[PDB]
Design a protein around this motif. Structure first.
Motif, short mmCIF file in Angstrom:
data_model
loop_
_atom_site.label_atom_id
_atom_site.label_comp_id
_atom_site.label_asym_id
_atom_site.label_seq_id
_atom_site.Cartn_x
_atom_site.Cartn_y
_atom_site.Cartn_z
N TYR A 99 0.70 -1.20 0.01
CA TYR A 99 0.19 -0.02 -0.26
C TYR A 99 0.87 1.41 -0.04
N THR A 100 0.81 1.88 -1.05
CA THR A 100 1.77 3.18 -1.10
C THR A 100 0.56 4.38 -1.33
N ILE A 101 0.82 5.73 -0.78
CA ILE A 101 0.26 6.77 -0.90
C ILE A 101 1.07 7.98 -1.15
N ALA A 102 0.84 8.81 -1.90
CA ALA A 102 1.68 10.17 -2.18
C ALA A 102 0.81 11.26 -2.23
N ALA A 103 1.05 12.17 -1.81
CA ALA A 103 0.25 13.45 -1.90
C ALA A 103 1.19 14.59 -2.15
N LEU A 104 1.12 15.26 -3.09
CA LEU A 104 2.01 16.43 -3.68
C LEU A 104 1.14 17.86 -3.60
#
Lengths: 6, 6, 6, 6, 6, 6, 6, 6, 6, 6, 6, 6, 6, 6, 6, 6, 6, 6, 6, 6
Positions: M1-6
């Motif tokens: 499970y990967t999450i990225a917020a830019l």
């Protein structure tokens, strides 16, 4: 194993 | 700036 | 094993 | 477990 | 700058 | 800025 | 900049 | 295995 | 488990 | 900006 | 910019 | 397997 | 499970 | 902007 | 820009 | 399998 | 399951 | 803009 | 622009 | 199941 380069 | 954790 | 270079 | 705060 | 390795 | 987690 | 690896 | 390059 | 906040 | 999760 | 990999 | 390139 | 917020 | 999910 | 892969 | 190119 | 919001 | 779902 | 693949 | 909204 984690690596980060800034 | 480099960081590595093994 | 952790290494950091600043 | 490694943690770094810059 | 703080770093801790456990 | 590069980050990799294995 | 904070990084943590568990 | 996750990798991100910015 | 790796987390990084920039 | 590239991200890959395997 | 936040990234987390579980 | 997910990949995104921006 | 990967999450990225830019 | 390209995204692929497998 | 947010991306999550489960 | 989904792919989108913008 | 992948989701991206731009 | 192209999208394909298989 | 939102995309989700399940 | 894929959905995209532009």
């Amino acid at each position: 194993y984690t690596i980060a380069a800034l």
